[PDB]
RNA sequence: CGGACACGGACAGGAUUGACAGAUUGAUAGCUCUUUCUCGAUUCCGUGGGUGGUGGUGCAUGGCCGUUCUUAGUUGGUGGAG
């Protein structure tokens with residue numbers, strides 16, 4: 001009840017991510033890839049094939065979420081506002097985490113990993 | 119572009135930077151073009167609004183300066199005259 005809800009919220013304050021329409025499928029090619037995330041609403045079955053094309057033979061893990069729009073307020077483009085429109089982003093399908101920096105509640109995302117995926 | 123901001127759009131399933139090579143230039147200006155790699159919300163676009171100007175107007179002015187003006191000249195108060 002803690003992995004899907006809140007311990008991926010706290011890995012998002014000022015950490016490394018992908019941003020915009022030119023680097024979502026970019027970060028996979030580097031040897032700094034910690035926990036990444038992919039949306040299970042992707043219109044083509046080739047992009048989701050392409051993110052598992054690297055990580056399934058390597059040390060990198062994706063978590064399948066609903067869509068990328070609900071990840072749009074997770075990347076950093078905050079559009080939910082008091083005098084602002086709560087609908088401005090069409091969010092990202094693949095962001096990574098380069099470095100955590102803080103270790104308050106960062107265990108519970110990797111606790112999900114080696115519990116079934118070993 | 120060194121067009122700030124403000125709003126809408128464009129906008130992670132494809133906004134924007136940079137650049138080797140060649141006909142391409144006056145020019146090793148990616149200026150543009152053919153082709154392709156690269157940059158990470160930075161911008162780009164429309165609409166308002168700034169802003170810059172050795173642009174106008176010295177007869178819209180300030181300041182400074184020249185001059186009549188290198189000569190002795192000028193002004194109140196209170197009384198006097200009208």
Ligand SMILES: [Zn+2]
Pocket residue numbers: 173174
């Ligand atoms: Zn003029």
